[PDB]
Subunit: 553 residues, 2 copies
């Protein structure tokens, strides 16, 4: 409960959903309008720490600085961070901002020789790292050709150097699948018959084939990439609630396109070297991790792809962790991280990363129960998710630290009462039963779960399976007899009667079997007697009476 | 190896397939042509003992006698047997033969008073037991009306008695669904306005409604009964290989019609009394048991229907046993009989009836393996059937007589080598494991089965399930590692890799899990990594990662 201090309410919301980028954007517009730059930079740093590879966000910080000469004391540290070697962003909009700053900082008119070379070095690094990969790159290539073309060769060396860069620019670009291809080739052909009428024919002719290939490959990309959307805002003011993903959200259709683009590249149709193919794949993965950033599959496929190639036992962990920063409630990434930590003997990290996911889910569940308390289905899914992760967590700690640890974990779930689901009880009975094949402790856990779930046909079903599985004959019939009028909707109830009857027939009585059948034909008239008799005599789950004798059934 | 004595070869074939009626027919035509009547009667008695309720066969014996005056010393004992109270046939062709003999034996011209009454008593017993039930009965009714109509009333009593029988005949027949309805009603209306013009109107009018009902009910019967076939031969010479079923054979389409006719009658649409409804149902059941005599379902439904109604703990056993005489290799009837014997404390009968089925299957299997040795699929089904019945037999004797008995039974299957199937081994390991939850004895049974089935993906699959189920961690991986190149066609192999990986992940190693995965991605490229990761983390058979997090999968 704050008063009427916007900054306080904003940070509270951010704290609740630290992955909701629009919330930071709002807090940033607010600090910017009040000119409180220390907080603006503090707010951005919070974003960068969590979303290091979201190039669009870095574009927002740089653009904010450009709009107000160019102070290098502020801009270079930022460029150094976002273009660093370990957390290196590789996005055309960010590179275009990079080039823009290099150009403004190295005046070609007033700096001559060294200047042109620095700028040209800039363009070439954008070329080698990104432009030969991104097919929607015409703005970049155009800007670089025009720069080289606009160069006034002073002396004879510069003159020879210019024609070289220009021919290097063309040969590089015209070989990859791109959107400027048809047009860049008209300018290349006119240009070769301009620099030398003798050599045109064989220069134009030495590319020719690779250019047709590039053009057809670009067509396939166009087909695959059909409705691909890339509209993340690159400026603070252009950010809206709509062009930024809400926590955990991603358009599955968009995800499928990224995965297909990546699948089309995994093939190395351009026949690049090992290192260039890897760089091309990496560029596309990073493009996807940026646009469907909340899709666990993209981070999972990326981390494994990176770690595949070469050694460095840290690589897979690195990308899974970036992914978890984006989706902290992701069980896929928590379990993946868990495997890597265990693989690298970072045992403490195993429990810590699992608890992290568990705590984030607990926050989602409490928020969902208070915010839309009537949404019974979403509340039930979340309870299930929470329970599931406690299950894997319990099984994992039993295996890694022993019975006493799994017991404490089960205790915490027992105290959450009906916040959790039946599964944690069933999974705990199995852990208890397998210590020495004793039934006492386990049966008590399941009896205790009955206090909360006796009305749950699904719990009763699996509880019966555990009893059969542990072979506690008398209990099987007891639980059933006692659950018959408690179980929700037939389907499971029909299926359970069959489970019990079959078991009791394997363990005689016949009188038991017979009455259990009487009530069965009472609760479910219209059930074919012979068909049910045939089910009762299954061996290893195969209804042989039907298969070998009552074929028409 | 006989010489050239037909009687010897014939009896050998009969002995091999005692349910093949045409074989007896051939042996009967042969004894009849050589006039060896002692053997003819011996041959028929063999048939009657096995097929007591096959009315058509009794018709064959009677017809054979009629064709040659009428010797009562021979005919009445036969009529007494087939129309007896316990094994009573109720079929129009047999009743028509009965009436024919009563008529020939009680001359109405030369015997007057008592004669007519005896004959009329005959017709009425056919009427009460069969004709008010069988809708294809016009020949019968016609013969009885014509008899009464042809009666020359001598005095005034006979005159009044005649009009009474005739009106009783009409009121009985015109109320049931039959094929003579439309026509019998034209003769009834003309007849009432013939015996009394004053009373016609109200007699004709008191039936009227019931007659329309009967006519519409007959139409439904016609619809249900569409292609129903009833062509069993009623005479020796009319019998062919085609109008008599071959061992175990029945047209499933015919069976479905009988069951539907019976289902249409189970309703009591005619609103008959308890006793009359039961007699109507019984008549139709017996008609079915005669025409699809090798359908286990007809005997099974009949025995239970009969035993339902009233007490007499012997009724269900009675009909199941007739059914087993028709289909001795039927496991459905052997198991059904087994339950009744146990229910009635006839414990010895349990094992005897099961061994009976087992021995008959052994005879079928040996005959199938020698007679068409290339039919691998039919040989494999029969081996499976044999094994299945040994399985139920073993489980039943363990339960009824103990571990030593089930052990002897398993020993007999172990000595049949590859005549049996993997199932008997798996079912025996479970019996062994559940004595005291020890693994030693059971594991040895399965290792021994590996000597015959290591190449059987289905055995390996279930063997792995038993190991997981018994939690023998090291063996699970051993068996798998050792079965990978032995298992037939993927499908099961893919499924098994997943089974093992999941188990090993529940029981750590990660290194084990990891390599087991390496080989898995080697043997099955194109398997989605994330999807497989998601399977590895299932809890209680539910892929929660997919369900709660990777929904689009």
């Amino acid at each position: 409960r704050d008063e009427s201090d916007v900054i306080g309410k904003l940070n509270d919301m951010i704290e609740e959903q630290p992955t909701d980028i629009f919330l930071y954007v709002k807090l940033l517009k607010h600090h910017v309008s009040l000119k409180q730059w220390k907080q603006v930079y503090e707010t951005f740093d919070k974003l960068h720490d969590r979303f290091p590879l979201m190039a669009n966000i870095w574009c927002m910080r740089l653009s904010l600085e450009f709009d107000k000469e160019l102070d290098a004391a502020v801009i270079e540290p930022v460029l150094a961070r976002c273009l660093s070697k370990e957390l290196g962003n590789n996005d055309l909009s960010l590179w275009l901002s990079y080039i823009t700053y290099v150009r403004k900082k190295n005046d070609i008119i007033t700096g001559g020789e060294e200047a042109r070379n620095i700028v040209i070095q800039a363009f070439q690094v954008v070329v080698d790292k990104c432009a030969i990969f991104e097919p929607k790159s015409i703005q970049f290539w155009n800007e670089y050709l025009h720069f080289l073309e606009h160069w006034k060769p002073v002396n004879k060396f510069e003159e020879q150097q210019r024609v070289q860069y220009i021919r290097k620019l063309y040969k590089t670009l015209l070989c990859q699948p791109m959107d400027c291809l048809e047009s860049m080739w008209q300018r290349y052909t006119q240009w070769e018959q301009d620099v030398n009428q003798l050599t045109a024919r064989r220069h134009i002719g030495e590319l020719s084939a690779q250019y047709m290939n590039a053009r057809s490959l670009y067509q396939d990309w166009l087909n695959i990439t059909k409705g691909l959307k890339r509209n993340l805002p690159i400026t603070l003011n252009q950010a809206t609630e709509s062009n930024l993903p809400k926590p955990n959200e991603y358009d599955v259709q968009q995800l499928l396109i990224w995965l297909e683009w990546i699948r089309w590249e995994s093939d190395n149709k351009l026949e690049l070297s090992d290192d260039l193919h890897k760089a091309r794949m990496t560029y596309v993965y990073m493009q996807a991790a940026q646009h469907v950033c909340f899709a666990p599959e993209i981070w999972f496929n990326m981390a494994n792809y990176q770690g595949e190639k070469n050694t460095d036992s840290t690589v897979i962990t690195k990308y899974l962790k970036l992914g978890q920063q984006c989706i902290p409630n992701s069980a896929v990434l928590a379990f993946s991280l868990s495997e890597q930590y265990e693989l690298n003997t970072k045992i403490p990290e195993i429990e810590t990363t699992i608890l992290s996911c568990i705590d984030r889910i607990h926050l989602d569940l409490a928020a969902l129960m208070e915010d839309d308390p009537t949404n019974e289905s979403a509340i039930n899914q979340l309870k299930s998710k929470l329970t599931y992760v406690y299950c894997v967590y319990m099984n994992t700690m039993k295996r890694i630290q022993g019975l006493a640890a799994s017991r404490k974990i089960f205790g915490k779930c027992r105290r959450l009462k009906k916040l959790v689901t039946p599964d944690i009880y069933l999974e705990n009975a199995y852990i208890e039963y397998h210590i020495s094949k004793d039934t006492k402790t386990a049966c008590k856990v399941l009896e205790l779960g009955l206090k909360y779930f006796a009305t749950d046909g699904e719990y009763i079903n699996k509880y019966l399976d555990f009893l059969i599985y542990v072979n506690e004959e008398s209990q099987v019939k007891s639980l059933f007899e006692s659950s018959i009028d408690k179980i929700s909707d037939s389907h499971l109830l029909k299926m359970i009667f069959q489970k019990v009857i079959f078991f009791e027939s394997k363990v005689g009585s016949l009188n038991s079997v017979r009455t259990l059948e009487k009530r069965f034909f009472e609760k479910f008239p219209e059930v074919n007697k012979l068909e049910e008799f045939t089910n009762k005599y299954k061996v290893l789950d195969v209804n042989y009476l039907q298969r070998l004798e009552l074929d028409y059934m």
